[PDB]
Symmetry: D2
């Protein structure tokens, strides 16, 4: 047996907290190189104190966020940083009613023989890392795999390998009391339409859950972090929020066992507002959906806050109020009760 009954209950508990009703996740875990591009976009230098101040900005927003945010995914460096008032960032997060999460993958690597496809690395020593992260206050984890729709992608070799590394990663995580968020991202890059994303999404989740079965993963103690199902970014043809919602809820109904505790969508380049509108179309779909359907958003919670901060410490409480509007909009959207410029900008970046 991979896990005892006591360990199993710890993971089911943690997982049910994160996606408790009306709650989602703040995906604040950009690498140093990734937060560089977002900082550069607003003229701000990429320094440890600027990254600490921006992350402090988001975690210390006012208590209206506390029922909207069940967990916060951090990057290594940030997990060991402190707020201005001396408190370490994980206590800041718990103090407001959220679970601390840590991103543990070490990025993507090319898979030879293929048309530009990648797998993901980071399992070397992961068991010790997780033990220490759990000791230092993290209770869930994140791993991101990346597949792309092209004419000979996602490859069979690609789907199989990424599904297998996901499951390893998750086996290790649960051995150490850490709930794994399983992230199989199909990028929106390309001109494919909606049905094609739906075919490819179904195909990839089927392989993911098979691989999870094979490796003995306790599914009640996992979260699934999939793309919404949407046309490609360069698709000429257009589709409604209902067509997207149907197509996403259909693909997940056909592949994800009800035992999975929560589905926390990535935004994938969607504008802040479209991400919220779609998330709401999905939770208003009449079809039966046996799991939480909520948000795990990075860019679609932070773009308005970033441009309202501008790097200027005076703008803190305008930036913080921009985050809290998107945090509140999504908490309503994952219950179907959201019906409403920098929030309308496409956030799509190639790869």
């Amino acid at each position: 047996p991979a896990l005892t009954p006591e360990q199993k209950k710890e993971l089911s508990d943690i997982a049910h907290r994160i996606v408790a009703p009306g709650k989602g996740i703040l995906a604040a875990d950009e690498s140093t190189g990734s937060i560089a591009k977002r900082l550069q976009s607003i003229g701000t230098e990429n320094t440890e104190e600027n990254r600490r101040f921006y992350r402090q900005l988001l975690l210390t927003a006012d208590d209206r966020v506390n029922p909207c945010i069940g967990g916060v995914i951090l990057f290594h460096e940030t997990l060991y940083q402190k707020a201005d008032d001396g408190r370490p960032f994980p206590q800041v997060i718990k103090s407001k009613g959220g679970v601390v999460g840590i991103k543990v993958d070490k990025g993507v690597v090319p898979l030879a023989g293929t048309n530009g496809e990648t797998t993901t690395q980071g399992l070397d020593g992961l068991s010790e890392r997780c033990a220490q992260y759990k000791k230092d206050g993290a209770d869930f984890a994140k791993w991101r795999c990346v597949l792309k729709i092209g004419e000979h992608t996602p490859s069979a070799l690609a789907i199989m390998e990424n599904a297998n590394v996901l499951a390893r990663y998750a086996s290790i995580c649960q051995q150490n009391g850490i709930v794994p968020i399983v992230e199989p991202e199909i990028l929106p890059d390309g001109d494919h339409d909606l049905k094609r994303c739906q075919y490819v999404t179904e195909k990839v989740l089927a392989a993911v859950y098979k691989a999870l079965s094979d490796h003995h993963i306790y599914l009640e103690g996992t979260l699934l972090k999939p793309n919404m199902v949407t046309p490609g970014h360069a698709c000429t043809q257009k589709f409604s929020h209902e067509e997207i919602a149907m197509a996403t809820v259909t693909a997940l109904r056909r592949t994800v066992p009800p035992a999975v505790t929560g589905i926390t969508f990535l935004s994938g380049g969607q504008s802040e507002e479209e991400a919220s509108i779609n998330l709401n179309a999905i939770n208003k779909c009449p079809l039966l959906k046996p799991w939480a359907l909520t948000f795990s958003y990075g860019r679609a919670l932070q773009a308005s806050a970033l441009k309202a901060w501008g790097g200027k410490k005076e703008n803190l409480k305008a930036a913080q109020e921009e985050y809290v509007k998107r945090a509140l909009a999504n908490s309503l959207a994952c219950q179907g009760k959201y019906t409403p410029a920098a929030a309308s900008e496409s956030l799509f970046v190639s790869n």
Copy 2:
């Protein structure tokens, strides 16, 4: 390159939903001729076409209190072409009472070389033309049975994969020709294993099945599954409550069966008529979320009392029919969570390596 058009998928889904509409279940009257003989020998009756015609008729024409109970009826090939005394074809007897007509299409288990007594099922050859015909002739769903066993080194990786593949080939051919497939990967109760063993293996098997149905591009909303409940093995020394069997069973399905599956219609196994109904009722009362219909596809466990009451004697026709009805009514309340409860219906109906 899609397997099915949007209309083909709507017909298949409507059919699958009529069969498990709330309160309803399936009567499996689909015994092979050599299998049903072993039943009539047990009530001292010769195995003639006419005694088979008569006993089937008794089940199909029981009074109209069963109609809200019976969503589908699975027939052996022979029976699909037989007629009541009325002269009405049995398909039409079934339809007129509100049920969908089903047909068993497998051709029995065969052994897998190099394994400890494990089997696949055969019957794909010419299946597509057989289905087109069965569909012209009134059938709207099919059944195919695969058999796995818990044992030392069984079910092996080979048997789990080969059996799931062939269920996937069967399912794809049925849907091309208009017919909802019931996917039955039966794990036998033979052996002394405990409940958790049977749960582990059931989860492994059903994950392999639904990966195979995905690889073969099967339309799940036009499917049903007929699995075993998660039960201790037949010879197991230890005792498990009905609520433990409900927990293990609902948990095993929630870990493997995608919500898109329209329904799960359990086989009775070796269980007695009364145990089959109580476990099914405890299952529908499990407060865990269960996004599919949980109902019955019972062969022995709808017919044990009827067959003992009938005894071979034309004079008991109405007395047999009544015992069948009382069980169909029991299982209709069980398949809604509302069954609160003789010797025939408490008797174990277990047979080593069930075959039909």
Copy 3:
């Protein structure tokens, strides 16, 4: 264990006879509908006696064929027919030093969900059929799967299913003392070039042998019947007999364990003469090749005999001498010693 030591030795023996040095197989097993098209091509009516006379024509050719032909694959009907002199056709075949073979597949069937791909049927009741065929004098068997190179073919589902039915078929065959000839045909249809056939050939054999392992097949008691590796039929670009030979011998070296007793190529639409020339390029390749590399030819042994018969009983010994020249040319070609109109005709037919 699938098989005892005594059964294993019977199959290794049979398999080594068929592909003994300088010997190949006559693939005379066309269905009734398939021999119709070849008969119609020469004006002859498709009647049982005409099919019996044509098959009698080939099996009763003079004793110069006896060291060229190790086995003869027949169709059901023919296995139960007799020569003019009363002898049943299998005794005719054995009397000249060859093994009787029987084709046991029941043709191809479409696989739904795919771009025109098929699997193959015929396992229903195959175990009994083989028991009876073995009793009636057959000692090996044939099963044909068909894959096609197009832009999304051979599919993963297609390769996996055909590899699995091959292995079933072969498990049954060996249980009954019958050596299975495993036929994974990649058709030459299309405009693909040589490397693409080589990639696809390697990919399909890798899956075939894995599937054979999984099902416990005794490989010393099998034969492999693959396509040569060649450009597609509509390829503009041109390739030498050496390039074909290298590419075929490379693909097989990379996928077929040395334990396989013999490789008996299908001709696939090649002209009688090209089939012979290529077979010889292959056996003259200096690279190491641990198995017999020989012929299992239907069309490329019979086209000249068919057109020389013309349906006229007077032409019997001109037709029979045409077969015996192609039989002798190939027996030399599978040893590298063949160096030399109706024999130059492309025999390619779509599907």
Copy 4:
């Protein structure tokens, strides 16, 4: 979309052929630091960088009678950057004697949750940049070890598949960066199983490996394999002749290893120096056709006498070296079928769950 250009494939194949050119074999001096300690404790010597530097030097600088014997030498990372007393880097000592320089790149076994004590190996992270470096620094082949065990329900389907996958990832990254991979799927001798058990399992494992290398688009002609011989288990009561071990071993390879594989360099296992050489010789004398080089990649079984003779004492340097040489000469005649034959070289070198 090819993994490798025609030149990349020629470099990889030339390298693979130098290493197993006829008569030659591999010296595996690639012990982890915590593993080699367990060796020097056995001759009462402290495990210091300098005692490790010295013992490796003794093996690498043995007289030039070993050069026709040793095609490659696998080094632990530490040793690749050490120098002889000459001041010459050990890579250059090896090259100058006619051998190819190898490097162990795995990072040890880790456990697989949910299994009976089974493991994968780890070490892919940053492997590509590690290889580029190792290649700049003189290394032309790599080694990665996976460990499987025969037991009740092991090796399981999970462990067989996961271990083959990760050997395939390792192999593809090595070839991108210029380096011939040695694929080592070691099946341990622990247990009391017989020879046929170990043959069955070896055939199952090597079929999974070579399916995985195909799925990952690995260039087999630039590969080597280091498997175990097919041997009875360490505790097996029954006795098997060397010719039976040759039969089972050559048969297992001929059923699974494609002829394109350039060579098979066996690990010694728990075998004594003398048994390792005799079984390897019986293997090369098997008259069955064997289209690949059959030679040695021996760690313990090239070094047991050398290490006991050296004893930690600088004065025995030439006496240790001589024992190593005599074994390298024995295994060079064995790896051609021509070995006709002390206590150190008859001693079992078995250790429960070998790790390094």
